[PDB]
């Protein structure tokens, strides 16, 4: 039933390896597969996330004939795409396999069936139409569909709403180096404000030496060529990393996160700015980031438009500021429209534990005040669960209602969190 959040009555002192980003893990797996398939060599992936979804990707690559080896977050990909008879790739809840793997199957010379199990889910017929437009011999308007590999994918130019289909656009860009004519993707909107997943993809392609030109607004062009075999050092995912750094901040202790990049495409700078304003010590060394928390801090006003995903951890920091302190978190009105309304959730849960959190047109106003034991609801949301864990470091008797909200995303979280404390 409930998960007792461990308390840190003395400062935490810990070195933690935070698992890698799911997005980067799946991107690296595809780029490693393509390099191997092209005969460019075996690649290694260090820091890979191991979860149900990344296991499904690993299985899909092995179905295509690639050799996958490793242990935990350390993987090697090698061999060739040679699927053989009756090859079938399970996709299921990993909408990622469906979007990233069909182009790779098209490089083989046999049929590969993609299957999974609703009426109320997102239709994939348009995805299949786009694959056909680029030269994939695929028949279906849904699952199951069969890519009939004939050793090449022509490529060309496709128009798509890259905001609505950003994962599919990433999938096409990942494999585009192998298309005969390359790929041009034209976004059909006149503006595209935030496309972090497409930008991550483009940055990773450049790390693999692929010629990608994204200099024109709303357009991405990849030229055909080899994908380099690399040592892919996957960056800790920023959201999860911040939960661990927040434990240093609230406990007044030290957390050192290993395998941190010299420069990151994730918005690490923005959160480090906030931590610096709470007077935490922040040291960016060799291949690690260390944060040491202060004995306490007062309230802060921060606009989180650029790092909306960090709202629950930041709200936890605000609730643990010196009593009486007022914090205003703004730039997050838009978050109300996401599947999970974390503003309503955060206000309810802080208030359930004896706190003071007010919803506002642009965000949350939190008054730090002493809290009491209770059941912190996660609402089946991993970020909400980590926020309760942060609160629990300082408040004895906080229990997160169901930690499965986090373990489905980050299986290692409860054990790594307990080892840290
Ligand atoms: Na209280």
UniProtKB/Swiss-Prot annotation:
Organism: Mycobacterium tuberculosis (strain CDC 1551 / Oshkosh)
Alphabetical list of Pfam families matching this protein: EPSP_synthase
Taxonomic superkingdom: Bacteria
Name of encoding gene: aroA
Subcellular location: Cytoplasm
Residues at the catalytic site: 309 (proton acceptor)
Enzyme superclass (EC): transferase
GO cellular component, one term: cytoplasm
Annotated protein name in UniProt: 3-phosphoshikimate 1-carboxyvinyltransferase
GO MF annotation terms: 3-phosphoshikimate 1-carboxyvinyltransferase activity
Family from the record: Belongs to the EPSP synthase family.
